[model samples]
Target: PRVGIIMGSDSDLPVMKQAAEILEEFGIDYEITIVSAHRTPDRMFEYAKNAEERGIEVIIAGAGGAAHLPGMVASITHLPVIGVPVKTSTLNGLDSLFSIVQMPGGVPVATVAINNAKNAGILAASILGIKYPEIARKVKEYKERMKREVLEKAQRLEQIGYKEYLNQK
Candidate 1:
């Protein structure tokens, strides 16, 4: 039930905070920290190594540019890791994506799209829900809600054409 949300730098906070928000919405407990893989490699190592002992069941790591934080954390912990590639560069996050996704064989890191911290949170919750029935129910309800929201939008468009709906607000 306890999740750890880590970022490579403070600048990633804006994008990474979405993960924290989504997790909190599901009534899950979590901890967030700025653990840089490059600047504070030792601290990052320590955090990842002791995460399970500290009651962390899942880890969500976000980074930009040559992002290695997520992969490095995965190397030290057996817990499910969800990586979010922050698009904080001229390359529009492709650089971050490749860095996190191209891990050597046997070391897999489940990665989300560029700056998609929301999906990271959902993935973490899904991973935990695999064993917890209550969590699983919550996830199912969340999915239904998302689908209903999109359906309602489509209904609105049908009531008042797309152009009129766009002009409304």
Candidate 2:
């Protein structure tokens, strides 16, 4: 039931923290750490290799440029890995997005939107909840809340029109 949140550097903390908060909201256990796939390659390797053994069911790795952390973790582990593309440098995260999403052949990494760690965490939960009924229920509730939000937004738009709805909140 534990998830691991690893960032390429401390600078990625702002977006990465969203992942932690989502996991926490569901009362799930998780650990966060700083590990660089380029600067601290060995630490990244060791962290990912032993993640499942340490009771981490899912690993969420975020990096900006040359974001290889997610793919490398997938290479080493059988557990699911979720990738968050940090918004950084010239491309504003396009580099990181393509780096993590375009895995070759057998290696697969579930990549979320740029700085979308909330979805990353939920995706991780979905992957873990596949085999656990209680966790599955939790995910279902989360989805229901999302649906409710959409409905509320639609209702507001209908009542006030898009312009007024935007002005409301």
Candidate 3:
């Protein structure tokens, strides 16, 4: 797999799956696993160290709480790490956002919105796109499809009026 996706808890899977879904849509191969940074920390360290040799071009990590999983992986891996902040019921994931987004001066982690792994996956695809033109084409098509869907809805709204559009929804 070219992409590696990991989360600390099984609870994170519900949101982290978005990353996998997007990768599949782009026809990219990816591996998803659970490598908790807090418990069995060696697994995270080992996983990040061997990621490059395993053909991982980018790493996507989604974790709640302090969300150190992303930063810890970014510490050792040469590959780009995209951070997806899983929402914390207590603080709406503000803590997670800070931990992942504000890394130490030297380490860098590319972060998306809270619980938004789809964007992380797309970002990984964009990084991979530099090497695979086919993925780039698919990404372009994906954006076009999103635009077209909204434009179609706008046209319908104009024809049917605001009240009718609201009713349709």
In the order shown, what is each candidate's alpha-carbon RMSD?
A: 0.8, 1.4, 0.9
Candidate 1, residues 1-169, lDDT tens digits: the string is: 7999999889999999999999888988999999999999999999999999999999999999999999999999998888999995599999999999999998889999999998999899899899888888889999999999999999999999979999996
What residue pairs clash in candidate 1, if any at all? Answer: none
Q: How does candidate 3 score on lDDT?
A: 0.94
Show where candidate 3 strays beyond 4 Å: none
Any residue pairs clashing in model 2, and if so which? none
Q: lDDT tens string, model 2, 90-149? A: 999999999999999999999999999999988878887987777889999998999999
- Sequence-dependent TM-score of model 2: 0.93
Least accurate stretch of 10 residues (summed lDDT) in model 1?
A: 80-89
Q: Which of the two, 1 or 2, has more TM-score?
A: 1
TM-score of each: 0.97, 0.93, 0.97
Give every collision pair in model 3: none
Off by over 4 Å in 2: none
